[PDB]
Design a protein around this ligand. Structure first.
Ligand SMILES: CCCCCCCCCCCCCCCCCC(=O)OC[C@H](COP(=O)([O-])OCC(O)COP(=O)([O-])OC[C@@H](COC(=O)CCCCCCCCCCCCCCCCC)OC(=O)CCCCCCCCCCCCCCCCC)OC(=O)CCCCCCCCCCCCCCCCC
Ligand SMILES: CCCCCCCCCCCCCCCCCC(=O)OC[C@H](COP(=O)([O-])OCC[N+](C)(C)C)OC(=O)CCCCCCCCCCCCCCCCC
Ligand SMILES: CCCCCCCCCCCCCCCCCC(=O)OC[C@H](COP(=O)([O-])OCC[N+](C)(C)C)OC(=O)CCCCCCCCCCCCCCCCC
Ligand SMILES: CCCCCCCCCCCCCCCCC[C@@H](O)O[C@H](CO[C@H](O)CCCCCCCCCCCCCCC)COP(=O)(O)OCC[N+](C)(C)C
Ligand SMILES: CCCCCCCCCCCCCCCCC[C@@H](O)O[C@H](CO[C@H](O)CCCCCCCCCCCCCCC)COP(=O)(O)OCC[N+](C)(C)C
Ligand SMILES: CCCCCCCC/C=C\CCCCCCCC(=O)OC[C@H](COP(=O)(O)OCCN)OC(=O)CCCCCCC/C=C\CCCCCCCC
Ligand SMILES: CCCCCCCC/C=C\CCCCCCCC(=O)O[C@H](COC(=O)CCCCCCC/C=C/CCCCCCCC)COP(=O)(O)OCCN
Lengths: 114, 83, 318, 347, 174, 105, 98, 115, 70
């Protein structure tokens, strides 16, 4: 009843985000505040098209925004952010409750620098 | 009222366990309809975001839907912060 | 490394069981104005070792009228479940972390019931059968009351995870929150573990050793080990559930020390009760739970359903 | 048994049947069946004796097995369609399981033995309620799922029911067993017409319920559970025997009595669908039912059996309790043939 | 694959073969407990931890009463075990042979029974790729018994109360 | 037989549970929500006979999603052919299927 | 259908055949009746968990409830029969005839 | 996997203990040693004879109450719903019906053991 | 005297210390000196699997960061 059409492996390639879950969770509220626009566009595309093959460009834009966000963090607040996500990573549940000091330092770093 | 008082006196002297059981059950049934915090509990259960908040396609006539999460439009949990 | 952790969970439990035997001897002796074992080793420390060696070098016999298959299986099941109940306990990190860690313990306890039933029926003796039926009645009563009490207490918690129990008891104690349920739960654990005043399956005064009357040498030692492991496990469960200890993620040894101290306190309370009270009758035990605890248990269950709603204090689901 | 407990158990039986007849969900239908059985057992065991206990035990075993098979059919249907609504079933195996389960609940052959056994075991009131209400519910389920019924299986079970009812009633002497075999035959007729016109099924159900209520209430009035006990009724209240005779003639399908209308309409409807052999065999086999009705009528009314000496004291005394709606049931079960076209209202 | 679900299904069938050959209610209850535990394992593998634990707990409680009743009502001088009787052993062996035949045929080829069509492949194959997040779908569906399903709660509670009344009335005697 | 008290009184006693495309807690979607929705929408308002005649394609897709019979047939065919090919050494699996690759994040 | 459903349905059929073939005791028949509902529970929960029919997860619990209601009914009838006859044999239930 | 390994370890350890117990010591069995125990005298009857159960009704009530607790167990998750009032009404309804069952049995003397 | 009971309780406490401390040490040892990840939900499990994939060594506890993205 027809042939399933799949995108080739050449246009499925994109620059990945090679940080861990703890790193992502540390810079998560800032990430949600900063890259809101591409992420919301991608989610609207996914929920309207109901097809992974129709929103690949939005996914690549999401990856680009994430990489821009992380390069901005890296160029200004590498050390406070490293301390923050190091504190987050230790916990088994990755609790925000146990790192309220490093989080304050990171928020102070990004409120001034960025 | 004298009959009720005598019955309660006799029950408290013979079956205090049953007296306490019925008192606790009656308090459990009646109190929630009078407490002002039941609505607060309902709102707290509502405010928990289990699933993803799918965005709406803007038609240009949605002034009450924020364009960004930090915009003043949208639900506010300031009441929950100071609670 | 998981096999190493299993061994580290098993062997110390058996050692603690043997020294609980010794400790109970000495505590009962000093409450009865005696000294207890102090001759076998320094302060009688080798007494459990002597007892274990004697039991496992003594001859075990199968009765002529017994059903050999269920005669052997019952001690095996008893000891296996006694060792298994320890795997979800957080001290402060469980060996096996279960999303529903409490219902697992309830199910395994209800299965641990059948060891004494099958050992009594397999022995094919009248005293064993009488002990088995006493076990049936006792399990009926304590099982229903235990189920409802645990339901209410965990309703104050939010889920069925013992780590979440620790998180809940970070600030205060469930004993301070819900002491009536704590009293009824302590009585129910006495009944569940068959300790005095509810030691009716193995009541020496009425029955000659009860359900394990025909068991000798090693198979008897396994029943003793299973019973004492259940005692310690239930006391540890009570300590976790009602006497919450502060947890430091970077130095977890403090939680282990506090948990061990509270478990030992509750076990000593068990021994103290055994030394202090007479024995119930099993009809009086059945009438105690259904006619006294069950009404209060239902009323407190209603109260603890309503209280989070009316005070807007519903715990988080996760 | 306390009157309050008895009335709440009767209310629970009726609630279970009503849940079955109003539910749109298979789980709720099964719940209604379970509630009906659970509240029906003590009603059978109301007058405690070993016969009542045995009848209740057999009834429980049969109904529990039927409920297990029905739930298996529901689950199998869910497996192949993912639908819970009671409609045409989407798996033939599930439909066959459902058909056999509902036949076992109704007492259709070859699942009939429990009907005479239980009816003999239990009292007259219990037998009346059993027959009437416990036929009422599964027939509603079958009417809902009619369009997927296997005609071959349904008609085979119906014809077996008619034959078995005729022969058993021929042999029996106990009035309760006679009524049970009559019920088996009438259920056979209803389920035979079921795959063609559920309206005709409902009409047969209503006429059968009216006739059964009249007959059972006459038996309760005369306090007769055997043939010879019924043979003494002409010497105490001869009117009851005359009414019983006309009701028995009606149940045999003799015109112009009400019992002819269901048979007539069913034969007409089946012939509309090019069925001739089945209606002819069904019509001819009812002569056995008529034979044992006539044999029962000879002993009660058309002949005078010997009486005893204490019947004089029974003459001196008068019946106290009044049966509710007995004259209405007796009239409706014998004189409603001219009102036949009301089945369109029943439609 | 590891065939864990299939192995547990086979053990389920074997326990059913035991208590259906029906040696004596003691061993029937033993087999039923084994089958309940194995079914708990099966549904745990499929995903339902609460449902598995619940069925295990309910059957452990139920078989306790059956033991007390077979000690009182349903006992004889020499209780029958599977090897004790010729009929019981015959039924047990017949059930085992039928189960082994079905297992072998299904493993060797896509076995289509006279009733249903079965494909011999992965229970892991039939599973779903999608995932939930930060809640258990089974737990939420069961917890919906109170918000949704008010009718089911009503009929269930009425049935339980009437069951108490009924069991009191049946055993009245006199 | 069927007394539609629910429809008459506007109540909802089991219609919430009849199908798996209805309102689910936390808006959890069913496995075959789309197929069931399509079949229901096709078959709405035309009755059983026309529903079985005309929405047969939608029902077939729904049953395929539910039971996965044709999909398992294809998978078994591919597995048997691959096993036969590697039995005689005519097929060599790639390293990404042999476990010698780095998957996507 | 996987082989798991085949095994569950086969177990149900075995339990059904066990109930319909009495030997001596009524208690064994009740055990066979309880096994049928266990198989039904397992089958229904396997089907529901696989299709993510979230609202149907409450069905197996109601199944268990009415299962144990039936078990209670059977135990009550068994005690009455035992009180009458001395044993739970099905041979003693023969007063009524077809 | 981990739980299966744990269960296997526990069962294997218990079985090894039984095997050591039954094989290490010297065995000397005869008819008098393995006879059943009845305080020194031969039993009159058999231990397989029926043993009357004076609490037969409480056992069945226990079955029904076990169902009730099974219904009540999912309450911690049901308290996270938005329909708090409906959830509370249904939970209290179930608990009141359980209490009513207990009260009916208690007043009708179903908790009194047979004499 | 009553303090002759203390050595037995001391030995029992020493035995009860072993399981918890051993479990904590083994959890930290097999997880790179950090707590064992708690995956009670599909989201947490997917996070662990992603960590394994991005680590490049098939270990979720080997955490990568800014030095790895650039
Ligand atoms: C995850 C678990 C999966 C399990 C899958 C299998 C089970 C499925 C469910 C049940 C259905 C099948 C039951 C097995 C039937 C076997 C054949 C038979 O008739 O056996 C009679 C045998 C009873 O015979 P008997 O009358 O006692 O023996 C006296 C003889 O007449 C005369 O004999 P004798 O006096 O001459 O003695 C000779 C010999 C007699 O030994 C035997 O008869 C061996 C019986 C074991 C099975 C052999 C095949 O004695 C010994 O060998 C001594 C050692 C016996 C103890 C070890 C038994 C190990 C069982 C495993 O029945 C059983 O053993 C029943 C129990 C079988 C299951 C064991 C596991 C139970 C676990 C309970 C807890 C579950 C929790 C989790 C849920
Ligand atoms: C039958 C016994 C063997 C099979 C049991 C089940 C094994 C497979 C379990 C796979 C699923 C799993 O790991 O789930 C994790 C769950 C725990 O996790 P969970 O349920 O919270 O969720 C899984 C984990 N997350 C949160 C990440 C999803 O395990 C359990 O719940 C334990 C179930 C135990 C069932 C025990 C049955 C009875 C066994 C008693 C044996 C005693 C000895 C008998 C013999 C004596 C005489 C010889
Ligand atoms: C079934 C379990 C299998 C796995 C076992 C896993 C390890 C078990 C660890 C616990 C061991 C428990 C016992 C501890 C030791 C004390 C008891 C003891 O010594 O028992 C030994 C027993 C002792 O025999 P016994 O019956 O006289 O025991 C009395 C022992 N004392 C005196 C100490 C009380 O030895 C034997 O039974 C065999 C002795 C040699 C005769 C060999 C006969 C041939 C069959 C076996 C050999 C292999 C044949 C291969 C070819 C077959 C085909 C032709
Ligand atoms: C973490 C907790 C783990 C468990 C800890 C258990 C602690 C148990 C208590 C350990 C203290 C034991 C002290 C030593 C007691 C015996 C000392 C002495 O009295 O006995 C000696 C016996 O010693 C034995 O030969 C060997 C040592 C046995 C005692 C030490 C036991 C060590 C612990 C055992 C293992 C505990 C775990 C078991 C598993 C003397 O015997 P012997 O010399 O001949 O007699 C002739 C001497 N003459 C010629 C002068 C007359
Ligand atoms: C009064 C009629 C008497 C004659 C008929 C008697 C029939 C038996 C008695 C039936 C009484 C109840 C029938 C009505 C059931 C209502 C079910 C539902 O529609 O209403 C609920 C409302 O429930 C109310 O809170 C009260 C429920 C009933 C309270 C207990 C009544 C017990 C009476 C029955 C006693 C037991 C006897 C039963 C057998 C005779 C739902 O409210 P809602 O909030 O939107 O649910 C959220 C669903 N969402 C998530 C999709 C939005
Ligand atoms: C190779 C065989 C190694 C040991 C197997 C033992 C099997 C056996 O036949 O012994 C059964 C023996 C009892 O036999 P008796 O009749 O009491 O007399 C013999 C005493 N030695 O039982 C045992 O040893 C326990 C068996 C281990 C339990 C395994 C169950 C799982
Ligand atoms: C409707 C709201 C309550 C909801 C349920 C309440 C929670 C559960 C409690 C109900 C469980 C079952 C109740 C059973 C009651 C009847 C049982 C009975 O028969 O008791 C009799 C009758 O005894 C009585 O006195 C009846 C109990 C009277 C208690 C009712 C008192 C009402 C309480 C009003 C609250 C007043 C507030 C005072 C607060 C004081 C401090 C708490 C005595 O038992 P015996 O058969 O003699 O014992 C065996 C001896 N051979």
């Amino acid at each position: 009843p027809g042939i399933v059409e799949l995108p080739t492996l050449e246009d499925l390639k994109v620059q990945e985000v090679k940080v861990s879950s703890s790193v992502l969770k540390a810079a998560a509220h800032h990430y949600g505040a900063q890259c809101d626009k591409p992420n919301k566009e991608f989610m609207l595309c996914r929920w309207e098209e109901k097809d992974p093959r129709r929103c690949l460009e939005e996914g690549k834009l999401v990856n680009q925004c994430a990489l821009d966000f992380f390069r901005q963090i890296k160029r200004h607040c590498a050390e406070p952010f490293t301390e923050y996500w190091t504190c987050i990573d230790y916990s088994g549940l990755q609790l925000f409750r146990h790192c309220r000091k490093q989080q304050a330092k990171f928020d102070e770093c990004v409120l001034d620098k960025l | 009222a004298g009959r009720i008082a005598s019955f309660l006196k006799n029950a408290w002297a013979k079956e205090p366990v049953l007296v306490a059981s019925f008192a606790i059950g009656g308090l459990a049934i009646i109190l929630p309809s009078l407490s002002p915090y039941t609505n607060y509990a309902i709102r707290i259960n509502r405010a928990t975001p289990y699933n993803y908040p799918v965005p709406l396609r803007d038609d240009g006539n949605m002034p009450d839907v924020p364009s960004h999460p930090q915009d003043p439009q949208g639900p506010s949990l300031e009441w929950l912060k100071n609670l | 490394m998981f096999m190493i952790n299993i061994l580290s969970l098993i062997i110390p439990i058996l050692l603690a069981v043997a020294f609980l035997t010794l400790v109970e001897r000495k505590v009962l002796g000093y409450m009865q104005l005696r000294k207890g074992p102090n001759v076998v080793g320094p302060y009688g420390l080798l007494q459990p070792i002597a007892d274990a060696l004697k039991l496992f070098t003594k001859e075990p016999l199968r009765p002529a009228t017994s059903s050999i298959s269920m005669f052997i299986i019952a001690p095996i099941l008893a000891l296996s479940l006694a060792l298994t109940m320890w795997v979800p306990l957080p001290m402060p990190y469980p060996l096996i972390n279960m999303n529903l860690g409490v219902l697992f313990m309830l199910a395994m306890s209800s299965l641990a019931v059948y060891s004494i039933l099958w050992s009594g029926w397999a022995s094919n003796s009248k005293y064993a059968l009488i002990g088995a039926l006493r076990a049936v009645a006792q399990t009926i009563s304590y099982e229903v009351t235990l189920a409802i009490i645990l339901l209410s207490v965990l309703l104050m918690n939010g889920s069925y995870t013992l780590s979440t129990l620790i998180t809940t008891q970070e600030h205060i104690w469930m004993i301070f929150t819900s002491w009536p349920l704590a009293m009824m739960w302590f009585i129910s654990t006495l009944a569940e573990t068959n300790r005095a005043p509810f030691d009716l399956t193995e009541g020496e005064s009425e029955l000659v050793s009860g359900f394990n009357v025909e068991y000798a040498a090693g198979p008897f030692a396994m029943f003793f080990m299973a019973e004492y492991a259940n005692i310690i496990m239930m006391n540890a469960f009570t300590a976790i559930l009602f006497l919450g200890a502060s947890h430091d993620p970077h130095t977890p040894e403090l939680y282990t020390i506090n948990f061990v101290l509270k478990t030992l306190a509750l076990t000593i309370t068990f021994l103290w009760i055994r030394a202090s009270y007479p024995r119930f009758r099993y009809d009086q035990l059945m009438h105690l739970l259904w006619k006294s605890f069950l009404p209060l248990t239902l009323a407190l269950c209603m109260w603890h359903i309503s209280l989070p709603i009316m005070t807007a204090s519903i715990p988080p689901q996760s | 048994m306390n009157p309050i407990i008895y009335t709440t158990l009767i209310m629970t039986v009726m609630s279970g049947t009503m849940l079955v007849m109003i539910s749109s969900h298979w789980l709720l239908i099964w719940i209604g069946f379970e509630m009906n059985l659970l509240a029906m057992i003590p009603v059978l065991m109301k007058n405690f004796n070993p016969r009542a206990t045995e009848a209740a035990t057999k009834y429980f075993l049969t109904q529990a097995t039927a409920s297990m098979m029905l739930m298996m059919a529901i689950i199998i249907n869910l497996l192949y369609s993912g639908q819970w609504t009671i409609t045409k079933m989407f798996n033939p195996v599930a439909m066959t399981m459902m058909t056999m389960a509902l036949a076992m609940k109704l007492g259709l052959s070859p699942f009939h033995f429990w009907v005479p056994e239980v009816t003999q075991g239990i009292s007259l009131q219990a037998g009346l309620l059993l027959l009437t209400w416990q036929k009422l519910a599964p027939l509603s389920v079958l009417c809902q799922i009619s369009q997927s019924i296997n005609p071959n299986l349904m008609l085979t079970m119906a014809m077996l029911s008619i034959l078995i009812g005729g022969w058993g009633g021929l042999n029996q002497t106990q009035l309760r067993k006679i009524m049970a075999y009559s019920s088996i035959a009438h259920m056979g007729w209803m389920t035979a017409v079921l795959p063609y016109n559920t309206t005709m099924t409902i009409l047969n159900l209503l006429i059968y319920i009216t006739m059964t209520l009249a007959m059972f209430m006459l038996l309760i009035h005369s306090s007769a559970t055997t043939t010879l006990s019924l043979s003494h009724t002409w010497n105490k209240m001869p009117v009851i025997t005359s009414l019983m005779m006309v009701t028995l003639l009606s149940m045999g399908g003799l015109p112009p009595l009400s019992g002819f209308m269901p048979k007539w309409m069913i034969i007409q409807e089946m012939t509309k669908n090019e069925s001739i052999i089945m209606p002819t065999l069904m019509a001819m086999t009812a002569l056995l039912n008529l034979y044992f009705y006539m044999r029962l009528a000879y002993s009660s009314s058309l002949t005078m059996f010997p009486s005893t000496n204490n019947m004089k004291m029974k003459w001196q005394f008068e019946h106290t309790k009044q049966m509710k709606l007995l004259p209405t049931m007796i009239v409706l079960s014998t004189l409603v043939l001219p009102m036949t076209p009301a089945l369109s209202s029943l439609n | 694959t590891m065939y864990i679900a299939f192995i547990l299904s086979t053990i389920f069938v074997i326990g059913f073969v035991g208590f259906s050959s029906k040696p004596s209610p003691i061993y029937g209850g033993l087999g039923l407990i084994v089958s309940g535990g194995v079914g708990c394992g099966i549904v745990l593998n499929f995903g339902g931890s609460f449902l598995g634990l619940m069925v295990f707990l309910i059957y452990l409680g139920g078989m306790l009463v059956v033991f007390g009743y077979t000690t009182a009502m349903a006992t004889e001088m020499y209780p029958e075990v599977w090897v004790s009787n010729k009929t019981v052993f015959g039924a047990f062996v017949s059930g085992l042979m039928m189960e082994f035949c079905m297992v072998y045929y299904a493993l060797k080829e896509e076995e289509v029974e006279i009733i249903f069509k079965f494909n011999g492949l992965g229970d892991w194959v039939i599973y779903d790729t999608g995932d939930s997040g930060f809640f258990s779908e089974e737990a939420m569906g069961i917890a919906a018994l109170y918000s949704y399903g008010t009718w089911l709660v009503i009929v269930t509670g009425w049935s339980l109360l009437i069951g108490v009344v009924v069991i009191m009335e049946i055993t009245r005697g006199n | 037989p069927f007394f539609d008290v629910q429809k008459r009184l506007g109540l909802d006693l089991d219609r919430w549970m009849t199908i798996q495309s209805a309102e689910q807690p936390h808006k959890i979607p069913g496995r075959c929500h789309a197929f069931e929705k399509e079949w229901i929408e096709c078959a709405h308002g035309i009755g059983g006979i026309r529903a079985e005649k005309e929405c047969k394609i939608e029902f077939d897709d729904f049953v395929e999603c539910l039971l996965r019979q044709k999909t398992m047939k294809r998978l078994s065919a591919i597995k048997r052919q691959r096993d036969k090919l590697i039995k005689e050494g005519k097929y060599t699996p790639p390293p990404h299927h042999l476990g010698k690759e780095d998957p996507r994040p | 259908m996987p082989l798991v459903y085949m095994n569950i349905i086969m177990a149900f059929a075995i339990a059904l055949a066990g109930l319909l073939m009495y030997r001596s005791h009524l208690m064994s028949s009740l055990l066979c009746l309880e096994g049928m509902m266990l198989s039904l529970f397992i089958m229904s929960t396997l089907i529901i968990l696989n299709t993510h029919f979230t609202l149907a997860n409450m069905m197996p619990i109601i199944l268990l409830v009415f299962a144990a209601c039936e078990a209670a009914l059977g135990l009550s009838l068994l005690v009455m029969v035992s009180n009458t006859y001395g044993t739970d044999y099905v041979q003693n239930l023969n007063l009524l005839q077809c | 996997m981990n739980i299966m390994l744990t269960l296997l370890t526990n069962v294997t350890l218990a079985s090894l203990l039984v095997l050591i117990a039954f094989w290490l010591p010297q065995l000397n069995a005869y008819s008098e040693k393995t006879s059943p125990y009845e305080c020194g005298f031969d039993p009159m009857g058999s231990a397989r004879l029926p043993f009357s159960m004076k609490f037969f009704l409480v056992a069945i009530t226990f079955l029904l109450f076990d169902l009730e607790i099974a219904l009540l167990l999912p309450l911690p998750w049901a308290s996270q719903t938005n329909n708090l009032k409906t959830m509370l009404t249904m939970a209290l309804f179930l608990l009141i019906l359980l209490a009513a069952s207990l009260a009916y049995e208690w007043t009708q003397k179903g908790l009194e053991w047979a004499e | 005297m009553w303090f002759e009971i203390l050595p037995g309780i001391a030995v029992m406490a020493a035995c009860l210390f072993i399981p918890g401390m051993a479990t904590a040490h083994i959890h930290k040892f097999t997880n790179g000196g950090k707590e064992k990840r708690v995956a009670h939900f599909s989201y947490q499990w997917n996070l662990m699997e992603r960590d394994r994939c991005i680590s490049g060594v098939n270990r979720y506890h080997v955490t990568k960061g800014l030095e790895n993205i650039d």
